[model samples]
Target chain A: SLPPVLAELDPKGPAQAAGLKLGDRLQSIDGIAVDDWQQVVDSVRARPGQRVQLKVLRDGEVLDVALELAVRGEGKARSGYMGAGVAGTVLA
Target chain B: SLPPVLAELDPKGPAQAAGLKLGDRLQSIDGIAVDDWQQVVDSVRARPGQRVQLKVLRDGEVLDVALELAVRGEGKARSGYMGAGVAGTVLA
Candidate 1:
């Protein structure tokens, strides 16, 4: 499988604010190449209130976007929420 | 931050069965390098009932282990459970 494609995004979320768009396929987070949707989820969820650099493939071009993640919950339950989700099905 | 350290494992888990030990620091999954505990979790959890290759730093050397992940839960909630966890605190 190739990098996961962005399927959903909250209009007011950090992902949208960072210029991320639906259909953009994630290639890397920070600098680590990610091949699974779970990798994207885990990477974003681990960095609450922190800036992360994302490399995305869009329209045959790879672009970079910087996103500052939002914090959710509190204490031990606290985590970053990027308000983005990957497509359930992907085509090569 | 470095690769996460294994802090716990289920006695009969695939990790233990594959010869993983406490304090082993994860380096890669399959062939992709991982730098965070979440990456390890995500990688393993996404591959239920599948075999995976793990590279870990143990003692002063790097070691490779082949693990066949165990499935947990059911249906959409199903996921691989490696029965391993990383330390909350790490020392360089």
Candidate 2:
């Protein structure tokens, strides 16, 4: 199982304020299990401005973090802005 | 412009011998100019085991590198495998 690792994050974003750090592996969000990075992005984007409980794996520790989604522009282009970049290895 | 950067690569892959380094920015492949990372991937996947010229930008220098694509499994599922991982900062 390849857990997505946080490759980058916005300095002033909500995740940053929530103590999310670079290289943190995301376990799940809102109690829903997460395996793919896209799943996490899709979930957060689907509910912009919602507070989600994130289970993150950091340096030898798994912590529960809460974050609020950043709002995007009006409809059609509307989506959640996490201000984070994630990386993962997918096997065939 | 935000060019795609090589974030990871296979040690024994053709790209490794072609002098593609981590953080190398891809400009274009074959005769087709590329702006998106998916475009590069799609183009390469279209032609497996074929020689192609790659234009890469590295450390303020642009270089043309030649490499061959690796073949994938048989049948309709067949596609080219470049054994590369690219990262790009996509802007809205």
Candidate 3:
């Protein structure tokens, strides 16, 4: 599947002010099942500024959210598809 | 630099029968800092049957654990670093 969501939005993250939160469980993208967290990464980065639906499971129920994708970081994905989740905290 | 350890050691996992527990935070491998869970994946999957030292953090304290790495499934790693942690119940 996908990697787990990792951090609070980075101060300078492309996703930072997109209202992304820590501990948001990714459920799907553009109506596709987010079998894992990587799907969330791939689906978002694949199309920059595209408004796709994100089925995020926050706090126990699935909530539909929308985000404009940003260009993927070439530096991080240079070696592998380690679409590392935004490092987050332990949220219960 | 490392990925987080997931699962309670699957009954049929490569880490199974090796005494890996759930919610244990991996700190290092062979004395190298485990910055993320992926490091745990690499180190363990690299040298099968090698006895590497694992420094794990459990319940807020650091502890040294050792294990003999074993044959890993290559089919899964072929595509990418989707080293998915074992799916688990919401323990917290």
Candidate 4:
């Protein structure tokens, strides 16, 4: 899978607030192509409370959205939180 | 987020054939550190029907195992198959 698909989203999270939806397959983050869910998670987690651009695929259409990631924890434990989860399935 | 944990496995697949188990966290592949599930999938898929080394975390101990990836399909569609799935959860 070149792009990871979103399976779940927090109702009050940054992604939903930015108009992202369930089943939206992430294509890229800030122009960097993300091949897996971990890339997306790493990207979002690296920049807490910062705005980032995201390109996603939904229903055969690609759309771009800007998200302001939510910050969680404090000090060294601080990180960006997107409140998103990937679909669970077998990959072969 | 440095290693991806295995959630599901095919009983008849090469991973099980090589003695891998569910809940085993992958540490590296062929001496390359794999930080996520996609890296593991890509590494395995890139080497169809080939033997590769894997370092995994099981029961608080690291174990090294060699797996002979099973080949799937034919021609351009051919690829290595591990028949594994990652746990579904929030990463942030």
Q: At residue A58, what lDDT does model 4 achieve?
A: 86
Per-residue lDDT tens digits for candidate 3, residues A38-84, read 55555555565444445566678554444434454466552212122
Ranking of models by TM-score: 1, 4, 2, 3
Model 1 TM-score on a 0 to 1 scale: 0.46
Residue A45 in candidate 2 has what lDDT?
77
Q: Sort the candidates on lDDT, descending order.
A: 1, 4, 2, 3
Candidate 2 has a TM-score of: 0.45
Tens digits of per-residue lDDT for model 2, A1-92: 33568887888776776667888888877667788777877786787765556667789876656556677769786877666776543210
Off by over 4 Å in 3: A1-92, B1-3, B12-16, B73-92
Q: What TM-score, computed on C-alpha atoms, does each candidate reach? A: 0.46, 0.45, 0.37, 0.46
Model 4: pairs clashing at backbone N, Cα or C within 3 Å: none
- lDDT for model 1 comes to 0.73
lDDT of 3: 0.49
Instruction: Give the Cα lDDT of each candidate.
Output: 0.73, 0.69, 0.49, 0.72
How far residue A75's Cα lies from its native spot in candidate 3, in Å, is: 49
Which lDDT tens digits does candidate 2 get at residues B1-92?
Answer: 34578887888776775668998888766546788777877777788776666667799976556566687768986877777776542210
Regions of candidate 1 where Cα sits further than 4 Å from its true position: A1-92, B1-3, B89-92
lDDT of 1 by residue, B1-92 (tens): 53578888889787886678899988777667887887877777788876666667899977556556788889997998887876663311
DockQ of model 1, rounded to 2 decimals: 0.01
Best by lDDT: 1
lDDT of 2: 0.69
Question: Can you tell me the DockQ of model 2?
Answer: 0.01
